[model samples]
Target: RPPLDERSLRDQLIGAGSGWRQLDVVAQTGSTNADLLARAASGADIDGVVLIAEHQTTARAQIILSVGVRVVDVPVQAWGWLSLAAGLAVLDSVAPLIAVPPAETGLKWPNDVLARGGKLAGILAEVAQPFVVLGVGLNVTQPDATSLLDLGVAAPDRNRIASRLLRELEARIIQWRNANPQLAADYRARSLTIGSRVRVELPGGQDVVGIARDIDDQGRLCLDVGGRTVVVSAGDVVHL
Candidate 1:
């Protein structure tokens, strides 16, 4: 019920030698992602900056967080890993707060977190040339969505949530930067898509039905359909 303590959060996140350039907390915002994207487009320097909105008109009852990431050296192919990396960070940040077993909380393909098959969080990554605004909407106290409060976390603190998420994000992004194999392995392990029957709707209106198999090095979902492996780079996946 309390707002984020910006000063204390800054001291905890940026002041702790986390390599983050700055941390800003706003009372309300339309979309943190849009704000950061516009800033980057205008050549504003927002690298390593963490932006948190206490109340987002665009994201109801959710924590709106966005970070400006400079991905000059990140290969375009590997850029698909950004959302997955953020999903892992979300899982890491909220795991200790929940009372349920780890399996109950998992990463849905592309950019969603699920709690017992219900939506828990959504991660969005938008690229503006060298800068990528990684945005996350985590259900904190929302109804009709699986929230941390609904998962047995009593009085989830926004400040702690922000600090932990930023820290976890930094760690995950570093892992992604190094092209670490463990990152892919971790995604595969936490994936709720793999080992299930899924229907992937492509942009071209093609639907591929198959058993989810694996996530490739480039972060594409590989599926087994009638003995053929169909690799999907983008799609709306519905687990069947």
Candidate 2:
């Protein structure tokens, strides 16, 4: 119920060589993602803009933030990795604060953070041509989802959490910019979807039932169906 130290966080996160351009903390907002997208459309330079809302009208008692990225910063084919990297960043930033073992926390392919078998957070990535808005909804003290408080950290420092989120996000984006070969491997190591029986709901009402096999370079999910490996590019995946 305390307010975030915006100045301190801005000072800690933005500086020379940092990918971030601006960081703003608002008392409340309907949706940071929507706001940034609108800002972009209005000719406002949204690239490198980071918006944090202490409370979101749509999603409450959570850490809701969004960062605007220019598409040119990463290759188009590799854009799928944007959300993947964001999910990994969430896990990496929140790992030290949670009481649960590291293995209990992991990334659900596409963009979810799972902890103790429950959803701890989710990532929402939106595109408006040249810009990609990466938004995160982390259940901090929310009652409906698995939260950091539920993980046994009584009063997690929300400010520190936001700072770490930005730091990890920038670092992950750096890796993407550099085309790091290890990014995929690192994602695989923290993945909970791979090796699981899954039913992917593809568009056009098609279905692919298989074992989640691997993640391709484009961040597509590879499924082993019978003897054939069907690579799914986009779908609502349900673990079966």
Candidate 3:
């Protein structure tokens, strides 16, 4: 397998990127996201930092992006919404390259990309002091499973996907910085969990079972629970 090249990718891939502007690819790492969190702790501004790896101890294809945002840039309460937008960006970026019809893709609540009823990618955004470290684990080519390659487009170019995703991510962040209603509209339009029955695993071993409803202004997932529409801020959502 080939490793990532820096200059060529920045010029060719992220040349159109508006949000983040740096790239680092290593042969292997435990977690690209973990590295950026460390960098942030050391006073490194991780905005636009994209970490790509070919072989990870945990997975095959992964990209970690750290973006620094100020409270003034977006309401701190809307960070959940921000992460959802980030996931939409990834889905939009990857959908075109999958060699599958656009209708085959959808965003799972809080932002996991699904294609043809299977997971294509997962997004994890964590707080690292002044920045948010966003980690993406995308299945490019998986054996006995759904992936970019399995969906179609064998031998898909990895960096090409990452670069397009970066550009889309930045654009959405810019659009969502104001926490506009359009952001919520777009998210609702693409969410598969909106009308699905879901079981959310909350902290303290609590369980929230309800029909997924609207996402509130703060980016919380709203669920209709036994004649009540309740909003859920954090939990593991499993669509039933």
Candidate 4:
């Protein structure tokens, strides 16, 4: 269960100003991303909406936060760029919990936040028509103490943390809508995966092993594969 009272969170977000079209909090949902995408595609509501659930059986102890937004401002490849920005924004929001500066938190290529060389969060984007559902899974508390798969930050005040996160996210999304040049530069500075060797599993079960050269102009991961350059748009990357 979230440490937050639903009405309190709702009021804060709703009172935060006119940046968002709508913000809703539920007690539980199978998937906030799916729920928001369905509501968006039905054409019943406007874009730039945020949805979050207190507790999910599917997510166990963690909660799901999703935002639905229209991407008419940028090209297809920049969707990945948007994800990168969202990841960085998350890094910024969670900085205080880990006692690190925002930029000091390295982003694993595409969009995963790494703190102290371990996974802190993972982000994924799903598309429906002109709307995209960007969802992030952040480790607020370790599911297991012996495991190294968490952020190592104990659970704090969930509502305050979430509100702060929402602000960072909204700001980054607005910046992304402009397709700013500094967005790409900002992503690179916090990227920890660019120079590492990785084994990437592409869609349709193909694997490519190479050095992570850079993130291309369009946010594709550029890999030096077998002395050839391969810019991958979709893949499951594992740092080797």
TM-score of 2: 0.94
- Alpha-carbon RMSD, candidate 1: 1.7
- Name the regions of candidate 2 deviating beyond 4 angstroms: 58-60, 203-205
Better of 2 and 4 by TM-score: 2
Model 1 regions lying over 4 Å from their true place: 58-60
* Tens-digit lDDT string for candidate 1 (96-125): 888889987788899899987788999999
lDDT of 4 at 3: 54
Give lDDT per model, in order.
0.86, 0.87, 0.73, 0.73
The numbered model that scores best in lDDT is: 2
Which candidate do you rate higher for TM-score, 3 or 4? 3
Per-candidate total of colliding backbone pairs: 0, 0, 1, 0
Residue-by-residue lDDT tens digits, candidate 4, 216-239:
877788999878998888556888
TM-score of each model, in listed order? 0.95, 0.94, 0.88, 0.85
All models, RMSD in angstroms: 1.7, 1.7, 2.6, 3.2
Q: What clash count does candidate 1 reach?
A: 0
Q: Judged by lDDT relative to the true structure, which candidate is superior, 1 or 3?
A: 1
Estimate the TM-score for candidate 1: 0.95
Q: Model 3 Cα displacement at 148 (Å)?
A: 0.4
